[PDB]
Amino acid sequence: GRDEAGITGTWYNQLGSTFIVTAGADGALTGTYESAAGKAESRYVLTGRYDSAPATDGSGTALGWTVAWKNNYRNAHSATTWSGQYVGGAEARINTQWLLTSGQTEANGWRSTLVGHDTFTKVKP
Amino acid sequence: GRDEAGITGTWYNQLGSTFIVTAGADGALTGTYESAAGKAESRYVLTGRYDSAPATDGSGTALGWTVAWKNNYRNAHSATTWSGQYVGGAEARINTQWLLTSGQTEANGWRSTLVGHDTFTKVKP
Amino acid sequence: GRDEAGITGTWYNQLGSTFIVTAGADGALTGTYESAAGKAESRYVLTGRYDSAPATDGSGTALGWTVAWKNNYRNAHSATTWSGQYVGGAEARINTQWLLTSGQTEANGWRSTLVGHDTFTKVKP
Amino acid sequence: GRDEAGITGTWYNQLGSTFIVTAGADGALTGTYESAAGKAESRYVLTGRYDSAPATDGSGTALGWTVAWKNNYRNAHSATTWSGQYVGGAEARINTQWLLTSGQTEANGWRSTLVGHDTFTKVKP
Ligand SMILES: O=C(CCCC[C@@H]1SC[C@@H]2NC(=O)N[C@@H]21)NC1CCN(c2ccncc2)CC1
Ligand SMILES: O=C(CCCC[C@@H]1SC[C@@H]2NC(=O)N[C@@H]21)NC1CCN(c2ccncc2)CC1
Ligand SMILES: O=C(CCCC[C@@H]1SC[C@@H]2NC(=O)N[C@@H]21)NC1CCN(c2ccncc2)CC1
Ligand SMILES: O=C(CCCC[C@@H]1SC[C@@H]2NC(=O)N[C@@H]21)NC1CCN(c2ccncc2)CC1
Ligand SMILES: [Cl-]
Ligand SMILES: [Cl-]
Ligand SMILES: [Cl-]
Ligand SMILES: [Cl-]
């Protein structure tokens, strides 16, 4: 992986959530997520993928991951996906937008999905 | 997994893409994705998560997955995340919304992410 | 307006909501919206814009509109924007994706916005 | 309008775009938008709506607006909708997420819509 070394490690977003990830040489992301917001407690499993051979023209590295919000402490019957890109350097960042879907009945499916954006950095707010 | 049996298998969306997935007892999703649209050829790895203990009131099962659009044939420097829910029964479906992020420079990050929606069923269009 | 005649009139979405709109020669959209779903009763004002000189290569006509969910009967402290395109012909359609923002405190702004998609046609479901 | 006075005026986002708006007592937004990014030149008409009787518990004021990207200088065959909320006070802000739809053929409709987020303040970056 080109940014295997750059992506692997601990990241923090603007809410104070903590994203711990290992980028594998093949394109795998694995790790844990702890949200500072919402119906969440302690760490949750995450998994995702990244482009292991990004362009070399200054473009970011595309990636995504998923958390289902069930662990031994809580189940929020929901899942978030973050889609974004890693941008390396002295002020490295993972810039994302996310979709948070809740389990809903038929009648309520139209209101099942929240959208937002998180920016992750290597130092915490 | 409650819908481990229901989610595992082959799904098809409205574009004719094919989503092959195994749901693990823990909440894992693993499999392959073949897109009928866009800068894609053959199968790509996917990974994701689902709620393995959904509500029993008729609500769907929340889930999500990621594809990074790199394989041995093509690299589109991009990744899609699908966030949605599985709804079982005779007309089982996975209803999703997705975010497709491309690697972009600084100047172009504002235009890095497409949004859309896919509906997957067990029989093809 | 090129599709002034095509856009003007009554449209219905998959939820059974009714969208009544007048497209002005300049690019204006004005009208009323009645939602079959959610915290809504009777008609609400809408306003928006469309491309009054679309491409002639078979592409759709880009457009958007807003409803704030306050009228004399109800206030849901929220607003939806639909962004999409009109596609003319015998099976004319307005294909959209929408963002529904609620008024929220600081602590809750991350969960203020729902996302979805509506397809409008000239005949009702 | 409760925040008629607060919303009316000039706002600037993180890209340096300028949003000039008048909030009417009824819930109307009218004005002009000048984008610092993308296929845009000079000012474009906008129109939208806001909640003219927001909650009084510290929640923001929901609102939305549309720009179709046609004026006398340029036509980008596209339209953006911003959905968000006004938050008053010494550091007043309009926090938004947006959908930017381009006119596309049938074959390409799946890739017609960009998503992002803008934060507007009364002082420029
Ligand atoms: O709060 C969570 C789980 C934690 C999400 C944390 C989010 S992930 C994006 C953002 N970035 C973070 O770092 N943290 C936040 N899930 C909800 C979803 C909406 N829910 C319902 C309930 C009833 N009807 C509809 C919807 C209730 C449960
Ligand atoms: O086409 C793909 C990869 C395949 C995506 C297939 C998509 S996934 C959601 C939907 N459901 C499917 O089943 N299939 C489609 N990626 C693009 C993204 C945008 N790209 C750029 C290039 C230059 N600047 C900006 C953006 C070009 C590459
Ligand atoms: O239901 C409505 C107003 C009517 C929306 C109708 C929607 S527009 C897109 C779709 N297409 C239609 O044709 N119809 C639907 N608004 C909500 C939003 C979420 N709300 C809260 C409350 C508390 N906390 C958070 C959020 C409650 C009020
Ligand atoms: O660039 C613009 C018009 C100006 C948009 C400015 C955007 S509004 C949200 C953000 N906040 C701002 O303040 N400024 C930006 N429109 C594009 C859309 C994508 N386009 C295509 C072309 C071909 N195929 C697919 C898509 C090309 C034209
Ligand atoms: Cl609910
Ligand atoms: Cl580009
Ligand atoms: Cl609330
Ligand atoms: Cl194109």
Author numbering:
A (entry chain A), B (entry chain A), C (entry chain A), D (entry chain A): 11 to 135
Lines from the paper:
We describe here the use of an artificial cofactor employing the well‐known biotin‐streptavidin system to catalyze a Baylis‐Hillman reaction. As protein host, we chose streptavidin, as it can be easily crystallized and thereby supports the design process. There are several examples using streptavidin as the host for these cofactors, since its natural ligand biotin binds strongly (K d∼10−15 M) and is easy to modify with catalysts at the carboxylic acid group. No enzyme is known to naturally catalyze the Baylis‐Hillman reaction, a very versatile and atom‐economic C−C bond forming reaction for the production of various functionalized compounds and intermediates of active pharmaceutical ingredients (APIs).
We chose a derivative of DMAP as the artificial cofactor due to its low steric demand, which will facilitate its inclusion into the protein scaffold. The protein host around the cofactor was rationally designed on the basis of high‐resolution crystal structures obtained after each variation of the amino acid sequence. The location of the catalyst is in a shallow cavity at the surface of the protein. The system was evolved through repeated cycles of mutagenesis, activity tests, and structure determination. According to the presented structures and calculations the catalytically active site is too shallow to undergo interactions with 1.
